[PDB]
Each structure stands twice: as C-alpha cells, then as structure tokens.
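Note to self: the last two entries modelled the partners one at a time, which told us nothing about the interface. This time every component goes in together.
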Amino acid sequence: QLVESGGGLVQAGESLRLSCAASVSIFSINTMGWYRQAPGKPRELVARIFTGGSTYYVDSVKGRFTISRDNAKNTVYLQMNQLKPEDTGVYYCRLGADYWGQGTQVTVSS
Amino acid sequence: MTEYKLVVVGAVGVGKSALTIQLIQNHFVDEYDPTIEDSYRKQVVIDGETCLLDILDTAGRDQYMRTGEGFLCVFAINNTKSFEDIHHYREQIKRVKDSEDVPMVLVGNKCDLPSRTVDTKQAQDLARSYGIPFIETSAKTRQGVDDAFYTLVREIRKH
Ligand SMILES: Nc1nc2c(ncn2[C@@H]2O[C@H](COP(=O)(O)OP(=O)(O)O)[C@@H](O)[C@H]2O)c(=O)[nH]1
Ligand SMILES: [Mg+2]
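The predicted structure of the combined assembly is written out below.
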C-alpha cells in the first residue's frame, strides 16, 4: 500500500514536493526511483537513489530535482524546484523492483 | 550534441547493472536488483567530443533493439554459460535490425576475480570472428568500465 501526494497545478518557476509513503518498512529496500510520463512521450526514469547514498538525475532535471528517502517514516520524496512546462506529467514512485505508486499529476503552466 | 543510444545485453548476473551504474554514478553497487530495467542519460566527453550517452541496462524488446545504435555484449569471465550465450545475443540483434554492421563490443566482466573459467584468447577469438573489439572490465574496481562504453561509441562513429 502506497500513499502518493504532493502533485498539483502550479505556475512555472514554482516548486512541489512529491511524496510516496509505504505502509511497510522500507529499510530493506536498496534502491528507489521516481518516473514520469509526459503527454506524447514514453515513461522515463527521472531520479534514482542507490545504496551508499548516491543519486542519479536525468539530464533534463539535474540541478532542480532532489530524491530522498526517510526510512523511519517509510517515505520517499522528490523535491522539484524551478518547475518548467515540460515537467508536466504523471509521476510514479518505484520502491525496489515492483512497488509502484499509482501516480500523481504534475501540471506546470506559464 | 550527439546522442548515442547504447544497450547493455548479456545473461542475468554478468554485471550489466554494475557496469552501467559504475559509468553513471562512479560507484560499485553490490547485488543490484536483477529485474530492474532502466535507461540512464549522461553527458560525457569522448575523444574531445562532448556527447550524451542514452544507456539501456536490460534485465531480460525487439523495440529497444531497433532503437539501439550500439550494443554491449557482456559475459562474466567466471561463467562459461554466459560466454556461450554471447552468440545468441549477437544473432538476435542482427535479426531485428536487419544489418550486417551493428556496432557491438564484447565485454568480459568480473576480471577482479581469480577463478577464471573463460580465458582471454577464447574471448579475443570470438570477438575477432565478429570483427568487434574485446574489452576486459571489473565493475567492482571500475577497471575498463569507461573503456568498454567509450570503445562502443567509437564503433558507432565508424558506422
Ligand atoms: N567481483 C565482481 N562482482 C561483480 C562485478 N560486476 C557485478 N558483480 C556482482 O555480480 C552480481 C550480479 O551483477 P549485476 O550487475 O546485478 O548483473 P546483471 O544481472 O547483469 O545486471 C552482483 O552481486 C554484483 O555485485 C565485478 O566486476 N566483479
Ligand atoms: Mg541488472
């Protein structure tokens, strides 16, 4: 069971914090990722955090997005700053291999 | 800026994820989940030319083989079965893309390990029979990692 929140309609330049809260402990899960599908485009990996703490960001969001995990809260976050219209899409958290959030809409207007 | 669509193929457990993550993150990630298949994008400088690598780390379709421009065919040097599967991946890639010249690099990973069941002449002989380079790697120590991906980009530039 994953509770997803933090999306919404914002103007360009504003920020959102996407959240993915699990009912179960996430401590044993070694990697977490955030995905998105924009209109007319295939799903893409936006950010991933690995064991040891290093993080990957797709080139389009590098410098604006931050992925983090809060083990004691069983929650994974995606901080999205300096939002652009092209950031519009449905965002999905993925905990490990097969725990997928059912999505949250992010819409960025000019 | 030129984008290169790379695909890492090979039997499960040969180190495809460990290689890809070492290139992207410069960290060895132990026992990465074997079913996770992701594409990573990374801006790099190869031979003085800045370019972007779009790398698909497969997890074991005909679509992503058609989209791919170059393929890393990985086996582990302590897994003879993974070495014998190599010709299956090359044949299956040559079938979807309909070409006799698909940029390709043979990669022998886990060279940090002493118990080696596939020796260098075997791998070089197979690579030479294909007309493709052979690069030895260790995702654990990062030996040869950049070399393997950069050699494949050079193979795409010839094509
Ligand atoms: N010693 C050693 N182990 C490796 C190397 N590359 C990968 N491994 C290990 O081999 C196992 C499978 O690697 P993985 O990247 O998941 O293989 P994949 O299924 O092809 O993605 C993991 O436990 C890795 O830690 C290497 O260069 N040296
Ligand atoms: Mg893998």
